[PDB]
Design a protein around this ligand. Structure first.
Ligand code: HEM
Ligand SMILES: CNC(=O)c1ccc2cc([C@]3(O)CCn4cncc43)ccc2c1
Length: 466
């Protein structure tokens, strides 16, 4: 009695559990590196920090490519921009100009700290009007970080009530929802097997965004001046101007898509982490209580928190590190691709192979972390609690190497200042219905959290002062 002819085999059920965890569970059986074949395409999944650092750092240039996806093609206007552009001249030029722009907010009066605090001050006055009510703080935080990035990109911002903010929120939501069903990593190409309108829907959302950025870029052409380089669009037009004396790599479509990536990444990524951090503080009142004490003893109510306070609010800094470990923004980074024949752990990897770094596995490795599934900001502090520490080398929240995060300085300062200002001024508690946020998460292009509500109250201590 023979065995059945076998035309296909997958190690776990598709659409059953979170992809990054399914891969991690497989390492028990198959090791920290294995492959899956899907037609002509082979994908390698790497789940150990030493192999990850080889792909990202040591052989970074070998695996600095991106795989081309029909979905990502539409969002990136055919692989323009930064995040979804393949390695090469385009990507390297626009990545440098983006990083170069964040230099113009180092110091001065538009010091990045000052643009951020300006928008947090509006956020906090906004939220204070909801004293005693339970609310979803998604949109208020979205507005604040949208204005930070609009100032970095255009030196402009939106006033309260501007309907355009809602238009952006709408198509941000629609693109993320249709960009991928779950993670960017899909084992089966359902998009090409059964009839569906995913690409149609994604196209219409991308049309609205492209139309909106065009209007901004068009009306700004007449305001641009060579001697005034104060934001990202200036940096890009200066390069286009000093090029027509590589100008094909600076067409209007190239400038638009790159600013779209910064606009998108700068908003959806920071809003999500704030929401996650809040959710964890609701499940961990003990940690929340010690944070209030920490900020009352090191900043008080004489002033508002500053970036310099990052040397004094250590537990707050440790909390942000722990959220970025436990619920990484990108559990599997963005997929990589081998530009040439190379190797990982001395295993052959052919050119064109898609390579995926399971950051979730790195952050939950039980040999590298103590009780990895527990929210313990303590793990990033010495036993005394007097200085931050790096307990593990298997920790890469922002990736590393050629394709690493370029908005890391912005994210860290936004996250620290938002939480510092909120904790100084507000009690943040379970809403009166008693529901706690679900910490399971929703894997999309970003690791999102289910929407939830918080009862916001102006702290008595903050009130008694002033
Ligand atoms: C908590 C916040 C953030 C985290 C944890 C984070 C993390 C990451 C990770 C893991 C990657 C992929 C690394 C790889 O593919 O190897 C990435 C890429 C990227 N991030 Fe973020 N990021 C954050 C915030 C931001 C912000 C605020 C911006 C922009 C304003 C930004 C812009 C980008 C871009 C453009 C890329 C693509 C880089 C490239 O492909 O060359 N990120 N980030
Ligand atoms: C209407 N357009 C959008 O909503 C939009 C566009 C591009 C995005 C890119 C990113 C990244 O670059 C890709 C993942 N990730 C982690 N950190 C930075 C990034 C994240 C969200 C985006 C949203």
């Amino acid at each position: 009695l023979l065995s059945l002819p076998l035309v296909g085999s997958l190690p776990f059920l598709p659409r059953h559990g979170h992809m990054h965890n399914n891969f991690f569970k497989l390492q028990k059986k198959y090791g920290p590196i294995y492959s899956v074949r899907m037609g002509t395409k082979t994908t390698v999944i790497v789940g150990h920090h030493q192999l990850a650092k080889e792909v990202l750092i040591k052989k970074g240039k070998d695996f600095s490519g991106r795989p081309q996806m029909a979905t990502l093609d539409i969002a990136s206007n055919n692989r323009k921009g930064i995040a979804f552009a393949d390695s090469g001249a385009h990507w390297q030029l626009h990545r440098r100009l983006a990083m170069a722009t964040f230099a113009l907010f180092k110091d001065g009066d538009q010091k990045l700290e000052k643009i951020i605090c300006q928008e947090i001050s509006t956020l906090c006055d906004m939220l204070a009007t909801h004293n005693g009510q339970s609310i979803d703080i998604s949109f208020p935080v979205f507005v604040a970080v949208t204005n930070v990035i609009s100032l970095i990109c255009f030196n402009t911002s939106y006033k309260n009530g501007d309907p355009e903010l809602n238009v952006i929120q709408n198509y941000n939501e629609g693109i993320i929802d249709n960009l991928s069903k779950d993670s960017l990593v899909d084992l089966v190409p359902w998009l090409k097997i059964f009839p569906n309108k995913t690409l149609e829907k994604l196209k219409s959302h991308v049309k609205i965004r492209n139309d909106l950025l065009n209007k901004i870029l068009e009306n700004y052409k007449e305001k641009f001046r060579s001697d005034s380089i104060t934001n990202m669009l200036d940096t890009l037009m200066q390069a286009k101007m000093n090029s027509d004396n590589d100008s094909e790599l600076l067409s209007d479509n190239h400038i638009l898509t790159t600013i779209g990536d910064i606009f998108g990444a700068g908003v959806e990524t920071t809003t999500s982490v704030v929401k996650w951090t809040l959710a964890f503080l609701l499940h961990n009142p003990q940690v929340k209580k010690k944070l209030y004490e920490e900020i009352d003893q090191n900043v008080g109510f004489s002033r508002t928190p500053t970036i310099s306070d990052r040397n004094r609010l250590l537990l707050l800094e440790a909390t942000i590190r722990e959220v970025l470990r436990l619920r990484p923004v990108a559990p599997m980074l963005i997929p990589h691709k081998a530009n040439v024949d190379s190797s990982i752990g001395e295993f052959a990897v052919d050119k064109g192979t898609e390579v995926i770094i399971n950051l979730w596995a790195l952050h939950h490795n039980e040999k590298e972390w103590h009780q990895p599934d527990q929210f313990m900001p303590e793990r990033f502090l010495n036993p005394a609690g007097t200085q931050l520490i790096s307990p593990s080398v298997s920790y890469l929240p922002f990736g590393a190497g050629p394709r690493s995060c370029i908005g890391e300085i912005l994210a860290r300062q936004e996250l620290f200042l938002i939480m510092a200002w909120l904790l100084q001024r507000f009690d943040l508690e379970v809403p009166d219905d008693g529901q706690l946020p679900s910490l399971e998460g929703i894997p999309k292009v970003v690791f999102l959290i289910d929407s939830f509500k918080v009862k916001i109250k102006v702290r008595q201590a903050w009130r008694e002062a002033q």
